[PDB]
């Protein structure tokens, strides 16, 4: 019956890692509010078991817990024996987080494989809630699972056209009506770009960084796994840029792109989630900002790849999540426009049309200013390549 939060983390992308490189994540996971990582991991990385070992350490070792997400991408239906001693190292380890007096294990894809095998080898009891794809499937298992872990974490109909927002509830909501008795794991994402020769795309997040947040306490699913702590080449990272992990080349549109700044929304909803409230609560007044670099429609001078696509479904917009103890107006300057609105109490998001230039924030109240400061990134007019992550930032009084 108690609610938990969890992230997802890239292991395949930290093969040099020390114990103390995870501890750092850990701690700015605990104070968020996260409860876990989900390791995501591969057969073929030769680091795998060096890192789960590093990572179930630091975890007891501040009071920080993990579970292991096998990536189905690279793990294989016959590597049933080695995922079986794999859960019999940690699923009673001290670090691994429990649910219901059972092991969390979750999948990246493999909706095939079978959890029987390995959870009656295991004495300790492990709690199988795999990514699975079909809603009606998750209905109907075979694999002996105990719930379903849905990726459907930006706005979809089902095919591979990419379409408008704003994000809405509607495969939440098939998953959980096939799932009856059984458990949820809802995702939770900021945003999606990703730039690669093998992908290149964005989804139509905009306000999603605040807004998901919002459908989960309507939502109230038994569980969350936020996407993602550290993919970077997707562009859906909540945690920091660190410098032990290996560039993959997303390094082009996430080394000056931080993303820290949405925790800050994350951490109220993830106290009001736990506690079963419909509202968070504001403690002191904050403001968390975030746009892309430069409007939609430039054309880049030497970008090999082309652009992603769906960028033509996308605003060019500067988002703010106002974090208020009493009601305030917001003032953004983008460029050479200036907008102000009257914000209410609460946590709100306003969007605001891009200029190229400085961005500028300021909210005041009774006539006095409060907080407020320039934006880390001027806005501009031309790129050598594709760039659609986006700068976050924040001001806190
Ligand atoms: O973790 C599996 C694989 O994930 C990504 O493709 C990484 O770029 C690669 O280095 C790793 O082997
Ligand atoms: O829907 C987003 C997903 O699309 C594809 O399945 C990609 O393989 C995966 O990396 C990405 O997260």
């Not at 997802?8 to 020390?18: A, Q, S």
């Not at 876990?36 to 007891?60: G, H, M, P, R, V």
């Not at 300790?124 to 459907?152: E, R």
Request: charge should be negative.
């Amino acid at each position: 019956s108690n609610k938990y939060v969890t992230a997802h983390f890239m292991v395949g992308i930290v093969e040099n890692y020390t114990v103390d490189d995870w501890k750092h994540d850990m701690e700015l996971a605990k104070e968020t509010g996260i409860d876990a990582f989900a390791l995501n991991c591969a057969s073929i990385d030769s680091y795998t078991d060096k890192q789960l070992a590093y990572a179930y350490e630091a975890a007891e070792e501040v009071d920080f817990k993990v579970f292991i997400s096998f990536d189905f991408a690279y793990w294989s239906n016959g590597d049933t024996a080695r995922i079986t001693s794999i859960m019999q190292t940690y699923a009673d380890h001290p670090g691994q987080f429990q649910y219901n007096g059972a092991a969390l294990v979750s999948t990246f894809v493999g909706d095939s494989f079978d959890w029987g095998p390995v959870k009656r080898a295991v004495d300790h009891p492990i709690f199988a809630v795999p990514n699975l794809q079909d809603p009606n499937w998750a209905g109907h298992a075979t694999t002996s699972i105990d719930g379903a872990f849905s990726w459907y974490a930006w706005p979809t109909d089902g095919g591979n056209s990419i379409i408008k927002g704003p994000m809405t509830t509607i495969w939440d909501d098939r998953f959980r009506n096939n799932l009856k008795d059984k458990v949820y794991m809802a995702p939770v994402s900021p945003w999606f770009s990703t730039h690669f020769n093998t992908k290149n795309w964005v989804f139509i997040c905009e306000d999603l960084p605040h807004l998901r947040w919002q459908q989960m306490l309507e939502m109230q699913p038994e569980l969350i796994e936020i996407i993602s702590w550290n993919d970077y080449g997707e562009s859906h990272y909540i945690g920091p840029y660190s410098e032990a992990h290996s560039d993959d080349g997303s390094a082009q549109w996430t080394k000056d792109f931080p993303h820290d700044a949405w925790r800050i929304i994350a951490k109220p909803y993830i106290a009001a989630y736990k506690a079963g409230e419909r509202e968070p609560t504001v403690e002191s007044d904050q403001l968390v900002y975030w746009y892309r670099p430069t409007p939609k429609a430039v054309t880049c001078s030497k970008d090999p790849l082309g652009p992603p696509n769906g960028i033509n479904l996308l605003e060019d917009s500067v988002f703010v999540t106002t974090l208020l103890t009493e009601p305030a107006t917001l003032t953004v300057g983008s460029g050479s426009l200036e907008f102000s609105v009257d914000v209410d109490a609460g946590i709100v998001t306003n969007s605001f049309p891009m200029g190229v230039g400085s961005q500028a924030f300021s909210v005041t109240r009774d006539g006095e200013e409060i907080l407020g400061g320039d934006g880390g990134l001027d806005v501009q007019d031309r790129c050598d390549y594709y760039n659609f992550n986006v700068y976050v930032g924040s001001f806190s009084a």
